[PDB]
Every structure is written in C-alpha cells, then in structure tokens.
C-alpha cells in the first residue's frame, strides 16, 4: 500500500577489525564445490 522508500542506513561503525585465522581441528569437513567446465587431453589424438 504505502510507497516503498529507501530510508536510512543501519550499518554501525566498526574499528580495529582483526583477521580471521582458520582453526586447526581433527574433525571432518566438506569441501565446498564449484561446478564448471573441465579441461582434458584428446588422448585418442595423442595415440594418433
């Protein structure tokens, strides 16, 4: 009903942000994938 307006910003200020270090752990994980094109040799043509 009411018009949709941007309004004001909400992000607060942050100071002295420290880096993230990957934590060592013996526990298992799952490796986040990327699905995309694969490159391969033309082994048949290599035989030729």
């Amino acid at each position: 009903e009411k018009p949709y307006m941007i309004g004001a910003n909400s992000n607060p200020n942050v100071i002295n942000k420290s880096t993230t270090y990957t934590t060592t752990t013996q526990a298992d994980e799952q490796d986040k994938p990327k699905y995309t094109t694969r490159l391969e040799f033309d082994t048949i043509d290599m035989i030729r």
């Binding site: 934590t23 013996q26 298992d28 994980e29 799952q30």
Partner: protein, 148 residues
C-alpha cells in the same frame, strides 16, 4: 503496542537427540568452522544414507533444495554446534542473544553486568532486552557486551 517474544534457536548438545532426530528424518543445520553452514539429512526410502545440501534457505515452492550423498562424521557433529532447520533463521540475528551476560548502565551511574533472560520485539523491529533484577526493558544502544 508490540510483538510477542521470539524464541532463540536452541543449540543441541546431546548427540543422542541429534541422532534420534536424524533417524526421524528431520533436517539438521551444521555450522562448520572452516567452510560455512550446511544442511544434513537422512535419505528417504530403503537405501538409507546421509545427504548434504548447501541450498542454505528454508524450502520454498520456487526454491527446492538439492541433496548430495556425504559421509558425515560423528566428530563433526560433536565438535560443531547443530540446529534444527525449522528454527535457525534470519528472522532475529540479535546482537545480544539470550543467556548472554551484558553490561548495562543503571540510573545511579554505576555499570552492572546482568544476563539477558528474555528478548522481544516491537513494531519497528527493535530488540527489547529483559535483565534479571529489573522490570524496565532496555534498548540496543544502551547495552554493551564484555568478552573474555
């Protein structure tokens, strides 16, 4: 003139209840430290096996989650906090969750630390905080957190 209190997503600590829910087939969400947040599920049908999906949102008619077979580890469950996917949500990412000890300024200009026992919200989406020993509900800006 407000909205009723909002429950926080209770983490599950006991492995037994986790396994029972999994056997029931209810979805689980695992906060992996290294590689983000993932969903865990038991395959339906006779061929039982665990499945994972990174389709990290509530299921919707226009957004159907895809499940990949994975060999989820017991240690992963134990060391990583796990939540029921029916609860864990973007609805309320409150800066000061329930049972958190926070520092609040009292009227006598003496800073005190109290544990948040109840949290609710209002029309504007604000976060009203209830602290033990006081009835008036504080606001986000007034409070402060002390870490370590």
């Amino acid at each position: 003139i407000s909205l009723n209190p909002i429950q926080d997503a209770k983490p599950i600590d006991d492995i037994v209840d986790i396994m029972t829910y999994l056997k029931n087939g209810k979805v689980l969400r695992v906060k992996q430290d290294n590689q983000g947040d993932i969903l865990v599920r038991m395959s339906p049908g006779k061929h039982k096996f665990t499945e994972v999906s990174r389709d990290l949102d509530k299921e919707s008619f226009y957004y159907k989650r895809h499940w990949v077979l994975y060999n989820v580890s017991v240690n992963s469950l134990i060391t990583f906090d796990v939540y029921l996917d029916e609860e864990y949500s973007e609805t309320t990412k409150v800066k000061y969750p329930k049972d958190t000890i926070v520092e609040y300024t009292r009227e006598d200009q003496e800073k005190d630390v109290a544990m948040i026992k109840e949290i609710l919200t209002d029309n504007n989406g604000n976060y009203f905080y209830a602290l033990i020993g006081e009835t008036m509900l504080f606001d986000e800006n007034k409070l402060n957190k002390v870490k370590d």
